[PDB]
Amino acid sequence: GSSGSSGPSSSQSEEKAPELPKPKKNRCFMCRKKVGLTGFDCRCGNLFCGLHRYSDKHNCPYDYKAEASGPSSG
């Protein structure tokens, strides 16, 4: 425990703030909307409100689509 008082001596910035923004915060990773239980875990390792879950909705980087049982050239 210590007060620790050192320059700058003048200070005009201090106020309660909400903990840092979680990496998920039970919120979509495309629109950033409260999904909580209505969340959707994509293969790319992200969360979606189901409306973006699709791969062609949030531009899913993953390739699982053209990885297994998917000889689709590309």
**Does residue number 49 form part of the binding site for Zn ion (CB under 5 A)?**
yes
Residue with tokens 């998917």: 70
To the question of whether residue 36 is assigned a binding role by annotation, the answer is no
H helix and E strand count, the chain: 0, 2
Measured from the CB atom, the residue of 5 and 30 that comes closer to Zn ion is 30
To the question of whether residue 17 is assigned a binding role by annotation, the answer is no
**Does residue number 52 form part of the binding site for Zn ion (CB under 5 A)?**
yes
Which residue type sits at 35? V
To the question of whether residue 60 is assigned a binding role by annotation, the answer is yes
Q: What are phi and psi of 27, to 5 degrees?
A: -135, 145
Measured from the CB atom, the residue of 11 and 48 that comes closer to Zn ion is 48
